[PDB]
Structure 1
């Protein structure tokens, strides 16, 4: 099930309009309170007008609207199920503006919702762009509008949330398709559940930021239910999905051909392991006792060229285990892995003990000391997040999480780890005064400017329960060593939520739930627009443009020359992300040093160490003196 974020608005005073309505199926059947009666557009002998179809409500007064619900026809017939849709709000009835929510609803008879940030309005309009099966009708048994207890205007200068993208599934795992710019999301064998999978199938969905189209596709070619997996973008730019519901499988997503390819089976069955791309394009994984059995799962490495998984038995998982009260089932999960120099992998946590993993020969592991600072040794931080915001300086920001996977209080701990050469003990300090809000199950992304956006989570980890939610996101500004609260959102994003940086510089945050009959499934995502995209007036700022790129494919050590339309002050390269269960081992940022060639022409070199400039796809962003970033240019970094 799902749920709206507000309380139902009284339908007494409403006035509704429909594009068409067949007698027996009047506009008002949708607001009678009877689930047996429904509005239905013209059919048969009234003709069959194709969608779009529209449902407009006049609440007569101004309500602080935060959502709507749509109960499809409950008579067993599917005709008229809304697929693609848009939701608009208006205080006047003539000026709608941009949709407050849009996307596609799954093809079933369950009540569907549109949850969105609170906006005073008197008029609401639901546009049915498509019928779920491609037919021309639109039918609605019941329609409700929800209101917030109050309305609090976003504060200027603190970012903005919206719109809401409605999806057919709970996006508990997502990736950006680098060649297309689309967001790829997946659930499990079902749109809203993973328990009871016959294994072998995964439901996916994609959102295209350019067209606003949400599409769904079932993947069975790899015979893998991809819930709870390791995810890494390999050296070739293929996304490597491992284990989870089908514990030994490997599935490859090729952005180029937009297809799924069966990969080789891992040597050890795992679920909830983290995998990390290496300086050589290979993928290392360790741990993962969620599925495949509970025992010590040492390292293994995938080679994209030979398409083999090789065991690395001496890359021992033992030193990275947390002290989880549930034991090994949780203690080897979601490692904070980072590919580094010379085939090494750094594990920053969640255990207090940090380690160096080596992939030569049969593997090795060396202690890197304890995450700690002048405030003491950091406790285990299961589901805390770790982000490499400056790969050149080896800087990793870690934050949040709790000692145990669940039933444990999250903390405000935050540290900065600075990596040197593999085998050396990195320096760790405390970050500022820690998070404003203790959280676990939160997600984060590094932004073009090197700041880290942190959002969602809860104060006490309770999977599938939307309790103690943190609605206020925070940004860490490394240059100032300061955290800043941002404007709050209205949708809880806790266990099974995700965040990804979009190529336009905005953040896509969504998911949460995936517990079948629970009412905590969130079949949506919201967009957060950081203040760097607005000018002083609250309007969107004018962005620099990258008019030319000497090349779109470069070897580490290589130079790229660009021309822009305005003088730029800074540039950064951001590796494309993948995310699930708080883990994102693919994102990282490299700040660039620019050579001004005069005439708004600039060159830069990609770092020559492929353990810094990990191979794969990256986003190039340039910023003007104002700090406004361009939309990214996609660059492929090869070794």
Structure 2
């Protein structure tokens, strides 16, 4: 199950309108209180009018709406089950504006919801754009509207949440398809659960920011249930998904062909391990005792060229283990890994102990010291996040998490780690005064400007429970060494949520749950629009445009020339991300130094070090003096 974010509104006084209704299947059947009676559009003898179909509610009064429920026809028949939909609010009944929520509902008879940010409204409208099976009708047994306890206008200058994207599944794993710009999400063998999988199947779903279409697809070709895996975008631009429910499998997603390809089996079966792309396009993985057994799982490395997994037994997991109470089952999970110089992998935590992993010969691991500051040695921060916001200066921001995977209090601790040469002890200091809010299970993304957006989580880690939620996101401004609270959202994002940067510079935040019958499944996502996209008036700012790119594929050391429509002040490269269970080893930012060629023409050099400019796909963003970013240009960086 799922749940609405508010309280059901009294349907006493309501006035409802439909595009059609078959006698017996009248509009009002939908708000009668009887799950046995439903509204149904014309059929048979009345004809079969295709969708869109519409349900308009006049609540007669103004309420703080925050959601809606749609209980499908419970008579064993599928006819009229809403797939694609859009929800609109209106204070007047004429001017609706943009949908507050849209996406697709899974084809089943469970109550479906639309949770959205609170908005004062008198009129509601649900548009059924499609029928779950491609049929013409639309049926609704019961429809409810929810209200917030109160309404608080988002404050100016602190970004905005919305709209909500409804999905058929809990997006507990997501990636950005670099070629398409689509957000790819996967759950498990089921749309709402992982437990009891026969393995070999994965439900996936894609959201296209450009069209707003949510398209779903079952993957079986790779004979893998991709729940609880390792994710890395290799040197080739292919997404490497490893283990999880099918502990030894590897599945390869090729954005280019929009296809899933079976990969080689890992040497060791793992679940909940982290994997990281190396300076040579290879993928390194270590740990993962959630599945495939609980024992010391040393490193192994994947060669996209030979399509082999090679064990690196001397790349020892032991030094990176946290002191988790549940033991190894959790202690080797979600390592904060970063591919660095010369085939090295840096492990920034969660363990207090940081380490250098080497991939030559049978591997090696060297101690890089302890995460600490003037405030002390940092404790284990299981499920804390780690973001490399300046790969040129080797700057990594770390924050939140807790000593144990669950039933532990989250921290406010935040640190800056500055990496040097592999084998050396990096410098670590405290970040400002730490987070405004302790959190675990939160997610984060590095934005075009080098700031880090941090959202969701809870104060105390209790998987599948929406307790002690943090609704206030924070942004860390490196230049200022300051954290800034942003406008709060309304939907809890704890265990199993994700965040990804979209090519347009907005953040996609979604998921949480995946616990079957629980009422904590969130079959949605929301868009956060950072303040850099607005002007003072609260309207959207005008964005520089990249009118030209000399090439869309460059070698490390390579030079790119672009023309813009306006004079640009700054530019950055951001590696395409992948995310699951707080881990995102693919994203990183490179601040570029621009050569002003006159006539709004500029050139920049891509770092010559493939351990900085890890190969794969990147997004190029230009900023005007105002600080407004362009939408990204996609650049393939090859070694």
Same fold, TM exceeding 0.5?
A: yes
Count of aligned residue pairs for this structure pair: 639
**How far off is 1:119 after superposition?**
0.1
Q: CA deviation at 1:562?
A: 0.1
For residues 257-284 of structure 1, the C-alpha deviation after alignment (integer angstroms, 9 at most, x for no partner) is 0000000000000000000000000000
Q: Distance in 2 between matches of 1:325 and 1:6?
A: 36
Q: Distance in 2 between matches of 1:215 and 1:153?
A: 33
Q: Shift of residue 312 of structure 1?
A: 0.0
Question: Per-residue CA shift, 1:570-598, capped at 9, x if unaligned?
Answer: 00000000000000000000000000000
Query: TM-score, structure 1 length as denominator?
Result: 1.00
d(CA) in 1 for partners of 2:312 and 2:212? 44
CA distance in 2, matches of 1:272, 1:57: 46
CA-to-aligned-CA distance 1:344-363 (integer Å, 9 cap, x gap): 00000000000000000000
Distance (whole Å) between structure 1 residues aligned to residue 120 and residue 498 of structure 2: 29
Offset of residue 536 of structure 1: 0.2
Shift of 1:564: 0.0
**1:299 shift after superposition:** 0.1
Q: CA deviation at 1:179?
A: 0.2
Distance 1:13 1:617 in 2: 55
Q: CA deviation at 1:306?
A: 0.1
Give the secondary-structure state (helix, strand or coil) at the position aligned to 2:228: coil
Q: CA deviation at 1:436?
A: 0.1
Shift of 1:506: 0.1
Q: Distance in 2 between matches of 1:486 and 1:245?
A: 36
In structure 1, what is the Cα distance between the partners aligned to 2:9 and 2:76? 28
What is the deviation of 1:399?
Answer: 0.1
Counterpart secondary structure, 2:28:
helix
Shift of 1:239: 0.1
Question: Residue 228 of structure 1 corresponds to which residue in structure 2?
Answer: 228
Q: Residues 363-406 of structure 1: CA distance to partner in whole angstroms, max 9, x if unpaired?
A: 00000000000000000000000000000000000000000000
Q: Shift of residue 307 of structure 1?
A: 0.0
Give per-residue Cα distances to partners, 1:310-367, cap 9 Å, x unaligned: 0000000000000000000000000000000000000000000000000000000000
Structure 1 residue 78: deviation in Å? 0.1
Q: Deviations over 1:606-631 (max 9, x none)?
A: 00000000000000000000000000
Tell me the distance in 1 between the aligned counterparts of 2:339 and 2:254: 21
Give the CA deviation at 1:426.
Answer: 0.1
Partner in structure 2 of residue 565 of structure 1: 565
- For the residues of structure 2 that align with 1:239 and 1:231, how far apart are their CA atoms? 7
**1:532 partner SS:** helix
Alpha-carbon shift at residue 58 of structure 1 (Å)? 0.1
Matches of 2:573 and 2:176, distance apart in 1: 15
Query: SS of 2:30's equivalent?
Result: helix
Distance of 1:219 and 1:524 partners within structure 2: 21
Shift of 1:18: 0.1
Q: Which string of whole-angstrom CA distances, capped at 9 and with x for unpartnered residues, describes residues 51-85 of structure 1?
A: 00000000000000000000000000000000000
Tell me the CA shift for residue 93 of structure 1: 0.1
Q: For 1:543 and 1:181, locate their aligned partners in 2 and report how far apart those are by CA, in whole Å.
A: 19
Please state whether the residue corresponding to 2:479 is helix, strand or coil. coil
The superposition leaves residues 218-261 of structure 1 with CA deviations (integer Å, 9 ceiling, x where unpaired) of 00000000000000000000000000000000000000000000
* Cα offset, 1:468, TM superposition: 0.2
Alpha-carbon deviation of 1:514?
A: 0.2
Q: Look up the SS of the partner of 1:490 in the other structure.
A: coil
Q: Tell me how far apart the structure 1 counterparts of residues 542 and 217 of structure 2 sit (CA, whole Å).
A: 37
- Which secondary structure does the structure 2 equivalent of 1:587 belong to? coil
- Residues 576-615 of structure 1: pairs in structure 2 closer than 5 A: 576-615=576-615
The CA deviation at 1:448 is 0.1
How far did 1:298 drift? 0.1
Runs (4+) off by over 4 Å? none
Distance 2:206 2:7 in 1: 30
1:292, CA displacement in angstroms?
0.1
Measured after TM superposition, the shift of residue 133 of structure 1 is 0.2
> How far does residue 210 in structure 1 lie from its aligned partner after superposition?
0.2
Cα separation, 2, equivalents of 1:598 and 1:205: 45
> How many angstroms does 1:496 deviate by?
0.1
Partner SS, residue 46 of structure 2: coil
User: What residue is the counterpart of 1:127 in the other structure?
Assistant: 127
Cα deviation digits, residues 423-460 of structure 1 (max 9, x gap): 00000000000000000000000000000000000000
Deviation of the 1:539 alpha carbon: 0.2
SS at 1:479 equivalent: helix
State the distance in 2 between where 1:242 and 1:24 align: 52
TM superposition shift of 1:188: 0.2
1:528-566 CA-partner distances (Å, limit 9, x unpaired): 000000000000000000000000000000000000000
- Give me the whole-angstrom Cα distance separating, in 2, the residues matched to 1:95 and 1:316: 62
Question: Any gaps of 5 or more consecutive residues in structure 1?
Answer: none
Whole-Å separation in 1 of the counterparts to 2:154 and 2:316: 49
CA drift at 1:462: 0.1
**Following the alignment from structure 1 to structure 2, what is the Cα–Cα distance between the partners of residues 209 and 430?**
37
How big is the shift at 1:194? Answer: 0.2
1:112 maps to 112
Distance 2:50 2:303 in 1: 51
> 1:497: how far off?
0.1
Aligned residues: CA RMSD: 0.1
Supply the distance in 2 between the matched residues of 1:29 and 1:590 (Cα, whole angstroms). 57
Structure 1 distance, partners of 2:22, 2:319, is 69
Residue 99 of structure 1: CA displacement? 0.1
- Specify the SS of the correspondent of 1:45: helix
Distance 2:365 2:198 in 1: 37
CA drift of 1:162 comes to: 0.1
Partner of 1:288: 288
